[PDB]
């Protein structure tokens, strides 16, 4: 069923989230989120207990009916408690959405925040659409998988987040590179896949997925 033909699913209960829930573009979002992350055990990047399931979760929100052009950051991370009440969009950014955003802004990402490029230090190397995906082995709890299997999992989880230009898994570096057709999908996928497991419900290790190390997802250089 098309996301257009349903209302967005509530992903978590508000009571599951830490208090002082911030606006996604708000002053304290990173303080709050970093605190959330640091609250987990132990030393490597936490494995988020929440995840976006695009087919299951995507749907209409009040945002769709209220002229909203920007996407819900909590939704991308699998942790929006609002569902159809949300005033931000709950679907995977598409060509239409992106066209409207282009008329609306040059300086904001798909979540309405300042684009990375406008404040980050350019280490050196025009619309970056490529993500570096690191710590693949750790996101699988060191499960013994082969490159064909590993590549299929990276492809599966990222391709459901937007049209893919190219994906590469690089065994020797324990990493992957995912290039989206559109910058908006890269922006969205980066937030969606950060700290995610790459285990699947069918894996023997699934119940112990928290004991891995969440994926590292950065802009590729
Ligand atoms: Zn939302």
Question: Residues 89, 169: one domain?
Answer: no
Question: Residues 128, 192: one domain?
Answer: yes
Question: Residues 129, 220: one domain?
Answer: yes
Domain count, the chain: 2
Residue 88 Cα to ligand 1 midpoint, Å, equals: 6
CA distance linking residue 136 with residue 150, whole number of Å: 8
Last residue of a domain, one of 84, 99, 120: 120
Question: Residues 91, 145: one domain?
Answer: no
Question: Residues 2, 101: one domain?
Answer: yes
User: Which technique was used to obtain these atomic coordinates?
Assistant: X-ray
CA distance linking residue 180 with residue 165, whole number of Å: 5
Residue 74 Cα to ligand 1 midpoint, Å, equals: 6
Q: What is the resolution of this structure in A?
A: 2.0
């Amino acid at each position: 069923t098309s996301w257009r033909d349903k209302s967005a699913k509530v992903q978590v209960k508000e009571s599951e989230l830490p208090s002082s829930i911030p606006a996604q573009t708000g002053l304290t979002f990173n303080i709050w989120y970093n605190k959330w992350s640091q609250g987990f055990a132990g030393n490597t990047r936490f494995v988020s207990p929440f995840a976006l399931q695009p087919q299951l979760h995507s749907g209409k929100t009040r945002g769709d009916n209220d002229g909203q052009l920007f996407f819900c950051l909590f939704f991308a991370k699998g942790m929006c408690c609002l569902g159809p009440k949300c005033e931000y969009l709950h679907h995977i950014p598409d060509e239409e959405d992106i066209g409207k955003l282009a008329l609306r802004t040059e300086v904001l990402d798909c979540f309405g925040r300042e684009k990375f490029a406008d404040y980050r230090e350019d280490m050196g190397g025009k619309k970056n659409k490529t993500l570096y995906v690191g710590g693949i082995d750790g996101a699988l709890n060191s499960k013994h998988l082969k490159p064909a299997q590993i590549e299929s999992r990276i492809r599966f989880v990222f391709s459901r987040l937007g049209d893919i230009d190219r994906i590469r898994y690089v065994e020797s570096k324990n990493c992957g590179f995912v290039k989206f057709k559109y910058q908006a999908n890269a922006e969205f996928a980066k937030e969606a896949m950060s700290n995610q497991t790459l285990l699947l419900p069918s894996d023997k290790e699934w119940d112990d997925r928290r004991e891995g190390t969440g994926l590292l997802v950065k802009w590729a250089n």
